[PDB]
Design a protein around this nucleic acid. Structure first.
Ligand SMILES: [K+]
Ligand SMILES: [K+]
Ligand SMILES: [Mg+2]
Ligand SMILES: [Mg+2]
Ligand SMILES: [Mg+2]
Ligand SMILES: [Mg+2]
Ligand SMILES: [Mg+2]
Ligand SMILES: [Mg+2]
Ligand SMILES: [Mg+2]
Ligand SMILES: [Mg+2]
Ligand SMILES: [Mg+2]
Ligand SMILES: [Mg+2]
Ligand SMILES: [Mg+2]
Ligand SMILES: [Mg+2]
Ligand SMILES: [Mg+2]
Ligand SMILES: [Mg+2]
Ligand SMILES: [Mg+2]
Ligand SMILES: [Mg+2]
Ligand SMILES: [Mg+2]
Ligand SMILES: [Mg+2]
Ligand SMILES: [Mg+2]
Ligand SMILES: [Mg+2]
Ligand SMILES: [Mg+2]
Ligand SMILES: [Zn+2]
Lengths: 116, 136, 177, 60, 50, 75
RNA sequence: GCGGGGUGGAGCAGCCUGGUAGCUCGUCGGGCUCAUAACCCGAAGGUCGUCGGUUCAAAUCCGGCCCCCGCAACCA
RNA sequence: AACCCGAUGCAAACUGCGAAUACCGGAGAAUGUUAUCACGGGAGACACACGGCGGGUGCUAACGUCCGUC
RNA sequence: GUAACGGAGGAGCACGAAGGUUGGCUAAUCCUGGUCGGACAUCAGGAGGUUAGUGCAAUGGCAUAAGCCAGCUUGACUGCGAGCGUGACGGCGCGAGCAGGUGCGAAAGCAGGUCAUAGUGAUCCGGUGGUUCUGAAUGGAAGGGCCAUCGCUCAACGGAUAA
RNA sequence: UGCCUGGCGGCCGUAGCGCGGUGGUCCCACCUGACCCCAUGCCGAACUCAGAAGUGAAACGCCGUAGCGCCGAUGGUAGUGUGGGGUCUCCCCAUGCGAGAGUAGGGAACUGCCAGGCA
């Protein structure tokens, strides 16, 4: 079970962030799509979200499951966060390696102005 | 003479023997011999009683022993003073509480069972009573 | 390649009909082939394990992974972490090429070949066989062979049962007595 | 596959007595001549008492 | 079996740390970058006799 | 052959539920994490749980394993 | 009570410091002799008191259980 | 006869359960010659005994012995 | 917290990685198939679920693993320390956080040795290195102080004497 | 507003298993390739990337189903604080507290935020 393995991999960092009380930028990656959510320290409320499943992001992208799409989502989530005034967040790779698409999303979010 | 084949520990605290027994019902046979008194049953006593009832039934029917002597009893040799460590294990006992079914019998008539249990009871240090299986 | 092409072109159709599979995904697939050599003599001489590895490399076309004792065993006079075997895992193109080479060339070259047992399935549709001599593989050179080394070949399949496993191998015309 | 750790593996021509020719990747490098193959091997092809003996030898 | 050794600052302050070493198993001299409080910098410290 | 024992280590709960504590105060001494650190509680090298903020001690059972956690509710 | 033992048929090693049973004699086969002994050549024979425990592994280390030695077993 | 399954017991150094009490903390009332705490002057004492309750040891022997608590 | 010549076992170390961090990983045992290969080696699959593991006793812990593997490393840092635990005392222990400087990580972070609890010895005397201290008329020096560190199976282990 | 799916939580078995059925528009999964980025103590298995021909087979989700796990009274029983009593190695009485097991029974979770598809 790849998912269960990934969740195990994600748990240590997620528990740490919860203990720190940090606002968390959670990323989910699938072969076809990438998702970014900014979740409140409680972990039960999503402040802002952006994904390749959203039409506005999807329409401008050739493919939703590549690094270019990842960068688009990173920029989108960050811009929405900045309007909300979040500014400072902690990146939750959610058991995925900090590399490739996940890394492209993060770099875009940093470029956009989210601090992490 | 019943004895544990092995034990985690050689010696055991004296302890106490309060409370009523578990296993108060005839569970394997038609008839049983139940303890009405509290006490210790030594392995030798259990064997003596077993031999008496077995001979009375003349190797007919089946006998269950519901008690097992798993408690080691130590004694100090004669002319030893107090102290210098706990004594050596001399024999094994089962702790008996009132209500404990000691033995059970099946495949014999009730009158024969009553006679056999009377012979066995004469070997035991505790007062006993004849019991029969019940529906509930 | 060729056997992979054959699998898709012919084997799938034959198996689909035979088992009345609802989906193509139901049809058994050859997941991987693992070649293992158990070099017990390695404990005496390290070079023997190296030579065995070189033989496995030549047959596989792939650098072998050295295996080491999971636990110490007095009987075999082995301590945990001591290298006592080598293995190669073949997947995809390399697997299909090896599978072809084995059936087409190596298996015929087996001495006194009378077919392979069809009872060598593990109960889960996976087939294991042993090669007594590395000579059968053309890559190995008889003249340069220092010692006769055997190997054990396992074919891991997605087949749920042995019947599906034997059918899959039969479709490729794997020799069976 | 990792680079520089594996044996050289190239397509080679394998020829048999039956005349079957197969081009396969191998570490052998040189072209191979084979005595037997799956096509011509007896098992694959399928090419693979006393009372009778008595009567034949001692027919009267 | 383990013997006490000094780790002496390369800064020439004369500041030293002390630790133990298994000399038979590990003959090679221990060298570590450690804080030298005299210079207030991390510098190389090298093993010496206690 | 017997006759030996070690000194008692004075482990156990030092501050019970509802007790007001200053930051730094030891709440429980233990071997291993019989109790786990919750909010505003730290875990020392010997698994001592101590207050990281002033407040009231709170014992709670939480998570899939139903583990006991000690937290400090800020005053 | 405290120590030391128990290993081819006999007497002794090996234990300490686990893996890796020796020596002398005796026994057996062949030889020398008229024959026996002596002598010469070749060979076999303890899985280590008896269980358990530890160990990947026990003659070896630990703990009984048995046996056999030594010392102690006292002061009113 | 392993294992496994059904039925039956046993445990100071067993626990997939679990009290009463005790203890720690908080609040409130009444009662109590502050009964509390700190600091300073002066000590004595550090052979305890029996009885009840919970135990180790001993033979659930001792006007025995060793702890806990009254 | 708690005694007995009560019941049972251990320690007088080890480790420059077996420490730090980042990334990853998950056990025992059994069954089936498989060259040599056997009760037991390595390989494949299944069951099982920690019945494994933890440098070393036992107990409590441990999957977010504290277990296992790899990369880079020296936080096995120096000065301090709110607050607290445990002691008749000498002492011993836990500790956020602050300053300086550092390692790992993209980052959040984590790191003041090791899953925790044994692995130890006061004072005196003396040794070694350092030092904005002292320096018996004065300048030095000697000697002393201060800081770092070394020498006791002082094991009858709060150590009567060097004997 | 409902239905369906994904992500993050609460909660931590009345929530987990087993067994049977069911789903691919989207989503998800498997999947298709790999010169790449990146990876294998060997292996594109995994990790990773570039994709979308195929299939819901597996996985996963959903629905149904007590073979189980799990939950679980009432009453009684055991124990026990205080006071009292006896035939005192153990009990009894008054009063207060009151299990464990077992029984009847329950039970195939519930729920918040955000996003997407559909009606
Ligand atoms: K008393
Ligand atoms: K002394
Ligand atoms: Mg004592
Ligand atoms: Mg203790
Ligand atoms: Mg004590
Ligand atoms: Mg108990
Ligand atoms: Mg109160
Ligand atoms: Mg005194
Ligand atoms: Mg006194
Ligand atoms: Mg007293
Ligand atoms: Mg008493
Ligand atoms: Mg008495
Ligand atoms: Mg007295
Ligand atoms: Mg006292
Ligand atoms: Mg006392
Ligand atoms: Mg202070
Ligand atoms: Mg002097
Ligand atoms: Mg002067
Ligand atoms: Mg002068
Ligand atoms: Mg000086
Ligand atoms: Mg003393
Ligand atoms: Mg009730
Ligand atoms: Mg109940
Ligand atoms: Zn041919």
């Amino acid at each position: 079970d790849k998912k269960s393995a990934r969740i195990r991999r994600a748990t240590r960092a997620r528990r740490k962030l919860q203990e720190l009380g940090a606002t968390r930028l959670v990323v989910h990656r699938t072969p076809r799509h990438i998702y970014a959510q900014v979740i409140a320290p409680n972990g039960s409320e999503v402040l802002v979200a952006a994904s390749t499943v959203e039409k506005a992001i999807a329409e401008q992208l050739k493919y939703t499951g590549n690094k270019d799409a990842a960068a688009a989502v990173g920029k989108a989530v960050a811009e929405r966060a900045l309007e909300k005034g979040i500014k400072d967040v902690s990146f939750d790779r959610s058991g995925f390696q900090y590399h490739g698409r996940v890394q492209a999303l993060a770099d875009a979010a940093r470029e956009a102005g989210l601090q992490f | 003479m019943l004895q544990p084949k092995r034990t985690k520990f050689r010696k055991m605290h004296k302890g106490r023997n309060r409370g009523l027994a578990q296993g108060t019902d005839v569970s394997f046979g038609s008839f049983g011999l139940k303890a009405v008194g509290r006490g210790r049953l030594t392995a030798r006593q259990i064997e003596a009683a077993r031999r008496a009832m077995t001979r009375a039934v003349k190797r007919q029917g089946k006998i269950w022993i519901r008690v097992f002597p798993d408690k080691p009893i130590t004694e100090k040799p004669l002319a030893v003073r107090m102290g210098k460590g706990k004594g050596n294990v001399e024999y094994w006992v089962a702790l008996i509480q009132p209500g404990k079914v000691l033995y059970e019998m099946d495949g014999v008539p009730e009158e024969l069972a009553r006679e056999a249990f009377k012979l066995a009871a004469a070997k035991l240090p505790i007062k006993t009573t004849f019991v029969t299986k019940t529906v509930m | 390649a060729k056997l992979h092409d054959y699998y898709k072109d012919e084997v799938v159709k034959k198996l689909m009909t035979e088992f009345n599979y609802n989906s193509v995904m139901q049809v058994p697939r050859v997941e991987k082939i693992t070649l293992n050599m158990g070099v017990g003599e390695a404990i005496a001489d390290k070079k023997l394990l190296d030579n065995a590895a070189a033989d496995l490399a030549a047959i596989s076309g792939q650098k072998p992974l050295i295996t080491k004792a999971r636990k110490s065993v007095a009987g075999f006079k082995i301590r945990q972490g001591y290298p006592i075997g080598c293995k190669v895992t073949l997947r995809g193109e390399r697997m299909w090429e090896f599978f072809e080479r084995l059936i087409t060339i190596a298996v015929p070259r087996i001495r006194d070949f009378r077919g392979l047992s069809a009872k060598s399935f593990d109960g889960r549709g996976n087939y294991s066989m042993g090669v007594r001599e590395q000579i059968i593989f053309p890559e190995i050179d008889y003249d340069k062979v220092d010692r006769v080394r055997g190997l054990d070949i396992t074919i891991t399949t997605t087949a749920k049962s042995d019947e599906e496993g034997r059918a899959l191998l039969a479709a490729f015309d794997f020799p069976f007595r | 596959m990792k680079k520089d750790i594996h044996p050289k593996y190239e397509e080679i021509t394998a020829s048999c007595s039956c005349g079957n020719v197969m081009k396969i990747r191998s570490t052998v490098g040189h072209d191979l001549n084979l005595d037997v193959c799956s096509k011509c091997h007896p098992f694959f092809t399928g090419k693979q008492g006393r009372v009778d003996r008595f009567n034949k030898r001692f027919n009267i | 079996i383990r013997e006490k050794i000094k780790l002496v600052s390369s800064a020439g302050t004369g500041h030293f740390y002390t630790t133990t070493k298994n000399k038979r198993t590990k003959p090679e001299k221990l060298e570590l970058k450690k804080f030298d409080p005299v210079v207030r910098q991390h510098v190389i410290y090298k093993e010496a006799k206690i | 052959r017997n006759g030996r024992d070690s000194e008692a280590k004075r482990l156990g709960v030092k501050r019970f539920g509802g007790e007001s504590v200053l930051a730094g105060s030891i709440i429980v001494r233990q071997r291993g994490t019989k109790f786990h650190a919750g909010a505003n509680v730290g875990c020392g090298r010997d698994h001592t749980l101590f207050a990281k903020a002033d407040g009231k001690v709170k014992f709670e059972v939480k998570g899939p394993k139903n583990r006991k956690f000690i937290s400090i509710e800020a005053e």
